[PDB]
Symmetry: C3
Subunit: 354 residues, 3 copies
């Protein structure tokens, strides 16, 4: 909600509370999943052409006891936008690969999980410098593109930390699975009369910890190549994305896939009375994975499920949903070693937002 | 404060800063206790009869150094209210037992501590599904009731976690003392010309960890039976609550009382010039407690104190208070083993709220 | 921004997002430093003369992965202000020594680091009771003073905590380096036609942990004596502060300087077109430090650098800066033992604020 708008500056203070419950045989996801989000979008008018802006978003789990706190920053960035020249922002933000893969990240509860957070330039991560251009300098309507750089987020600097290695240290160190070296990426999208087409590419240097702490999927670089299609008109939403990755797709907590072929497709319709049915298919197929937890593998499913669900919108501030993950992965030594969910999940949600 | 009210949606952004200091011989409570609360109540008008709502409340300690952060969610829920039919909400919320026991939880600083948080269905906890009905479908003024369900909040799912057992795992695992199985509860209250009468009952299944990790007060279920009385009129506030519990009242960090008889009573008056004196008595008497930390017990006091204090209200946004816990527990092997405060505490508070 | 102003109460909900990056050979500070601040200043009008107020400020790091959360309260206090009599507030706040030393804490990114947080009464800390008087009861314009008390913030109360000692326990325990005993301080400042002069003194009792856990700089008390000068007019800002400390200046994580002589000086000019160049010098000279990490020392530099930089203000809501720490400390056994940064740092910042 816009809580302030005066002297060439406005502030949108937004958030949501999602009363959420998972039903599953997988007890590590079963039960109360209640959470909330809080954030602000701020925008100041410097000149007629120049805009300054800042955005921050925070998730706070609502399913924990008061003896603990599970919360985190999703995004936190500041930037400048000049009319028909482009925008530049820096901070924690979305990687440009998500410009295209977001087209399928529209399910009521699940979806969007052939990649993760702090996963190179595929979704949210630290230290993104992002240039964006809308309508090609105002010359070609519907033609957007983006060029992005991500600085290294490396190893821990404290010598007594258990994860300490001494290689690729940065101030904001973390575990190898959420590290990254210097990276560059770009996206291009074209919209025309409801139809949309998109491509995105990213190439990140991999850190020392990522290639020398016994994790699978080692190599000099992590790469992604994404193509996307969508139709968004007449209350119909169809979308599909195909991404091919190299040393970039996480295989649970074991490391990365040497190569992965990811596919997501979704079909949705929006009734005027408030109901919005959703059907989707997601798969991540690892290729030539090699040795994983004591056994040799070639091709293995990392993710594979059909998603059936529905959201009912009471209005723009209140909604409820059901989402049903029909999991098609088999329970095997690969999935157990990686700790990948292979059971079905039903989600029931009640959401207030402002 | 109401910071937004437009297009059938309003947002109350509220909070307080309590500059608070404890004086006590008990050094584990002595010293700076400064804290703050922040929250929002959001409400959207869907139709003339149907309201959607969401609420979130967060406590952040103000007595810690910047090298740490001690904060937590108190409540986080979303819901729907239909005129003369009832309300339904889900999330982290207050258990229905608190509908009656809250009548005595009105002291300046202390009180409200014959039960705790994440303590089955007695106060705040995760995964409450709560149906509420006010004025019996609009037919009997002053007659409210509630029916509540709490889903299991069980053991940790991570095999390498030190608290891991493998039994009763849920996604949002925690220590046995703050766990709970499936639970059901209800409350009924009747108000008439200042006088009030209330009853509440809860029955929760106890988890495996709760009955097999060496904690006292084991059994199939945790049960509470509460009766309450109050008078709230002519600037006078009197209230009393009696609760009898089975395997539900925590005896410090040792487990639970096999049986407990809890009693709280409070008398307050509100002068027009701003002063509000307060006198109260609280006791929790454990019955047939059995073996506790190497010794056999029958009846023992878990809690016993008189509370004398006063709040002065400068206005609705600013107040100050003194609260004096006159502790009647003796320092003995039981209280030391449980880690229960047995010394007197004086609290001085200065509170800004919005 | 003022998001509420009604019924004799107003609320300023403020904050900033700083997209920030450090370039340094020191890898423990190199990389993404993005962060945000959030806070509120609330003020209620009780009578024509009496004002009630509360303030809270929170920092949340924007450079971490979502698997962790690095945040903290900077200030959290409530208070009362009576016209021409003074103000009183209690909570987490700034020590009165900072009334004078803040005059040099005005650099784009660095500076203000001859002292730290939770460092006795020198900057932010827990449990400050602060009396402030502006314009000497309204009798002498430009003459301010302050009298402050800080309650003990001592050792941890949990017997199984690794930092447990059993001495000087308070409820809000923490590590010796951020502990303090009972302390008293005062400041006096006089402003006249742009020029300013200030003096401040603090004396804190040192805790048992501080003098018996193998830390350097032991003694009965921690003392500071500060003198300050400034000129703030005609778009020119000049300021200098000199502080002499005893058992109060932290030498990295090793303890404190027996004695320290701190000096900060800054010169800034503000162009109307938005640019604000900055040049500064900071030094902390330890005196008679004694034995430190196996070697005997007399005089050693704890801090020594020149700071060159600039801030460009697009407007009051958006700015960008560069800051260049030219580090004059040599890399030696003292600095390595203390873990003090001895390399140069360049900072680039883009800041949105509201
Ligand atoms: C022309 C308005 C009615 C359109 C009906 C849409 C049916 C969609 C079924 C998925
Ligand atoms: C096992 C208890 C299930 C609780 C259902 C909560 C539903 C909330 C969203 C409507
Ligand atoms: C009729 C107004 C005066 C009432 C005085 C109340 C005295 C209360 C003492 C506790
Ligand atoms: C030992 C120092 C006591 C500090 C008192 C603070 C009072 C704050 C509430 C008025
Ligand atoms: C009178 C307006 C112009 C003043 C110029 C200031 C120059 C400052 C150089 C640091
Ligand atoms: C303008 C502030 C943000 C600049 C970010 C620079 C990133 C450096 C990559 C090594
Ligand atoms: C196995 C039952 C699934 C039902 C979800 C709607
Ligand atoms: C022992 C002194 C108690 C005073 C509290 C008002
Ligand atoms: C060593 C290069 C420093 C430049 C900072 C402006």
């Amino acid at each position: 909600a816009e809580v302030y708008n005066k002297d060439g500056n406005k502030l949108d203070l937004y958030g949501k509370v999602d009363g959420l419950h998972y039903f599953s045989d997988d007890k590590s996801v079963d039960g109360d999943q209640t959470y909330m989000r809080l954030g602000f979008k701020g925008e100041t008018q410097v000149t007629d052409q120049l805009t300054g802006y800042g955005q921050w978003e925070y998730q706070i789990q609502g399913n924990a006891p008061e003896s603990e706190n599970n919360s985190w920053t999703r995004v936190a960035f500041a930037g400048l936008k000049f009319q028909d020249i482009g925008s530049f922002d820096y901070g924690r933000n979305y990687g440009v690969v998500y410009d295209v893969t977001s087209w399928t990240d529209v399910l009521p509860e699940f979806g969007g999980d052939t990649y993760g957070s702090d996963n190179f330039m595929q979704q949210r991560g630290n230290g993104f410098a992002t240039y964006r251009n809308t309508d090609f300098f105002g010359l070609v309507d519907g033609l957007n593109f983006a060029v992005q750089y991500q600085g290294q987020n490396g190893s821990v600097s404290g010598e007594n930390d258990p994860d300490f290695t001494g290689h690729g240290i940065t101030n904001n160190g973390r575990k190898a699975l959420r590290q990254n070296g210097d990276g560059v990426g770009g996206s291009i999208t074209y919209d025309y009369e409801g139809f949309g087409v998109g491509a995105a590419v990213s190439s990140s240097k991999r850190t020392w910890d990522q290639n020398n702490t016994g994790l699978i999927g080692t190599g000099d670089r992590a790469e992604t190549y994404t193509g996307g299609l969508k139709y968004d008109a007449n209350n119909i939403y169809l979308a599909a994305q195909y991404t091919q990755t190299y040393n970039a797709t996480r295989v649970g907590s074991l490391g990365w896939a040497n190569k992965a072929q990811n596919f997501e497709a979704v079909a949705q319709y929006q009734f005027d009375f408030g109901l919005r049915p959703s059907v989707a298919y997601l798969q991540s197929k690892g290729k030539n994975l090699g040795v994983v937890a004591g056994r040799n593998y070639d091709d293995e499913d990392i993710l594979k499920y059909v998603d059936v669900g529905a959201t009912y919108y009471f209005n723009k501030n209140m909604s409820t949903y059901v989402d049903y993950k029909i999991n098609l992965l088999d329970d095997n030594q690969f999935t157990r070693a990686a700790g990948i969910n292979t059971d079905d999940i039903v989600a029931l949600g009640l959401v207030y937002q402002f």
